[PDB]
Amino acid sequence: VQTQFAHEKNNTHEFKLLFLSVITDLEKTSTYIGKLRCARELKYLFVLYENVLVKSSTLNFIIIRLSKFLIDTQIHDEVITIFSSLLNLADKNTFEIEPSLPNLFCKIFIYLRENKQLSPSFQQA
Amino acid sequence: IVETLNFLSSTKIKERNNALDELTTILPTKALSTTAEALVELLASEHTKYCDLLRLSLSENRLSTISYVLRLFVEKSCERLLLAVVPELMVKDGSKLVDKICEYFQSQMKLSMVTNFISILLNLLALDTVGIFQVTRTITWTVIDFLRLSKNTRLIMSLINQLILKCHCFSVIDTLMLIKEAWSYNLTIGCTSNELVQDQLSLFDVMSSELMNHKLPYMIGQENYVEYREYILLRLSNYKPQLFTVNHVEFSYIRGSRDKNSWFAWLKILGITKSLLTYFALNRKNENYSLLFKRRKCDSDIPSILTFLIHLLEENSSFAEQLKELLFNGDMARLFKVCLPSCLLLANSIKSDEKTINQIYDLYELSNESFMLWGYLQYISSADRIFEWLKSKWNQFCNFISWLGNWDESHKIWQHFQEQRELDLTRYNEILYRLLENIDNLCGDSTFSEFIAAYKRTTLITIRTINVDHLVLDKINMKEIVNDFIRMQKNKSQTSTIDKAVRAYLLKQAIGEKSSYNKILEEFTEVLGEKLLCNHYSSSNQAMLLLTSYIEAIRPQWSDCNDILDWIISRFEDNSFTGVAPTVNLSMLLLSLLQNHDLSHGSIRGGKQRVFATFIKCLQKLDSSNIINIMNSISSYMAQVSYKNQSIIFYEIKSLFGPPQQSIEKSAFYSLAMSMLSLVSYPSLVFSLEDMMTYSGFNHTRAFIQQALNKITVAFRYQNLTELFEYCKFDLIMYWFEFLGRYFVEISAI
């Protein structure tokens, strides 16, 4: 946790740099392999933890960038992130919008089709 | 006591084992030695007798001379567990463990004499596909090809197993293991050869048989001909290019194949295609006394003109295919040829009704799928009429299909079907298959009619003399294809029919099975050794399967008690002495179990036990690696342990060339987070040259691009190198594939 301990010394902590880190991770595991994707999945959870800053209705990209192949080293991660995001979208102001929905649906309907194993955590979210 | 030993050997008294039973007791002294040696039904004494004749260096020399030739060599040809290890040591002395001694005999053989046995040994080597020395398993080629051309099809055929891959430069460290596995798998050479011979008849027609291996050996060496042991290497290479063994005997043998080639020869006009155009090809090579394969010989001959088989052999360098695979006015003109002919091959390659009828009528008289389907591909009413006649004339497999590929056809089928409905059982089974193949008012009517007809026709088809045999009056023939499953079960059980056994057990089934398994286990415990080695491996392999089956039963029932039974069996089986190469699966089962679960450390212990297992290296490690990789479970402790184990296998350098192959696999181990660094570290550990650069090219190719062009990881790996004494201005030059290193790692250095 030394990296976290060092990271904890967040002098001049802001917010926006998070964006760079997120887009960097998306590229890295858009390719390579499932092990890398698994590494990124853990990183994504950490990014969410790191994402202390929030702006309700202005964030939007609560999901959106999350609409990734929810399969292999991603199905559980996408679910964890989506479920966590759903909680975030319920929490406080909630700011549960909808102009991302068409794509969310494209991913939901295919990944919950395929082998047709949706899990109750989906429905609860 | 010589008289007694002779009487004891004396065969005939209970299958000639009586000599072996007497030997077991024996195991005057010289006579006793002959009696103990009889353990081989009797013929296992002559060696003892040779020592006895000498009646002491001479006795040892005599026994050894006789072991080489006195009687039958009781599992001495290729020795076929401490007794076996001792035999291997003796083998090294005899050459004057197993693998080691191999290097002594091969060498001795290369340097002097040592044909079917030698060829069989070559096949044994192919089955080996490695060696605990290599040279002792490569440098045999000299004396080899020597006595070879020095001087039936079967010996050449045995040589073929090795000849097939008589080349250098390629996926090493693993290629040897792969060659061994394939050559050993073909080891079942026999009934399969008979099947290939049957396929040859189906394929067309060439010669006897037992010649496919004889030609394959030649074809592989011929490919080579067309193309510091390294210097002598290239030397003898160019030699074999024009020097191998027995070129006159083979030339005469080739006549059978030449006859087949002549038989293979508008197509009819080609029968005299430039008389001996092929002779020009032969002359080009013979005159060269070296030639330039590629096609120079082909160029001398050839006869193109406005072939399938051509492109075929071309790429090669279905019956024929399967053989080698196992080892390792135009309408009128065409119809006339088809009527004479086969026709199906020409018709199939090509992918007018009266013309079709002339040929179909000839086919009808001959009266299968190949012709019917080849004709369907052209989709001919006149030929359809001949096809109805074909059914009349007939009075394999497919038939109706062509109908599906292409209402008169239904009517003809109905008439034939009616005739079948009218062993009748064999015809009925064929009809059912045909009906499916052709899959229509008639068909609907037929579905109902057929159900009744099949039930009626089936009777006509009509343990050893009862439980299985009672069915055999019908089943011996009825089961000979029987798409269903039941005869295979009878054949396998010996080591609907399955449904009855399943019913006998029917989670509840696991309990029934457990009781049955216990009974089998008791019998096995009682047998405790016997096969003389076969029982050992058989037990090790069976134990692996049985323990695995018991654990599987818990999973299916879930129950858990069955996994406990597996563990109890495993514990008993932990005594060691895992059956020769038979325990391989067991270790594999243990590793699989470790991955599957354990919830009690046992997985860790199982991994250690597997880690301690033997083997000519290579293979098992790879399989295990793949299996583990196919696993996620976020963490950082088990992976580290796995990495450490893999690293332990990084030392000794030299054969790093093998390590480079391992490194490509290590990198292509889903890599992910952290581990990329581990794969990079593994590469840092060894250098059979830019081996890494090649290994990295392969791993990168798996992950896109290649080696330096696919570095990326360098962002951290260069830092790992920067951290090193030489730094990034001494290592990254290779990573970049020096000033190149200093540039490639400048940030890493900072």
Numbering used by the authors:
A (entry chain A): 1270 to 1394
B (entry chain A): 6 to 32, 40 to 67, 77 to 101, 109 to 124, 159 to 176, 181 to 217, 222 to 297, 308 to 345, ...
The authors write:
ATM/Tel1 belongs to the evolutionarily conserved phosphatidylinositol-3-kinase-related protein kinase (PIKK) family. ATM primarily responds to DNA double-strand breaks (DSBs), whereas ATR is activated by DSBs as well as various types of DNA replication stress. Under normal cellular conditions, ATM is inactive and exists in a homodimeric form.
Besides the 4.1 Å cryo-EM structure of symmetric dimer, we also determined a 4.3 Å structure of asymmetric dimer of Tel1/ATM, which allows to trace the course of the polypeptide. We next compared the Tel1 structures of the Compact and Butterfly conformers. In the Compact Tel1, the FAT and kinase N-lobe move down by ~5–8 Å, whereas the Spiral of α-solenoid moves upwards by ~11 Å relative to their positions in the Butterfly conformer. The overall height has been reduced from 190 Å (Butterfly) to 175 Å (Compact). However, the disordered fragments in the Compact monomer release these constraints, leaving sufficient space for a peptide substrate to bind.
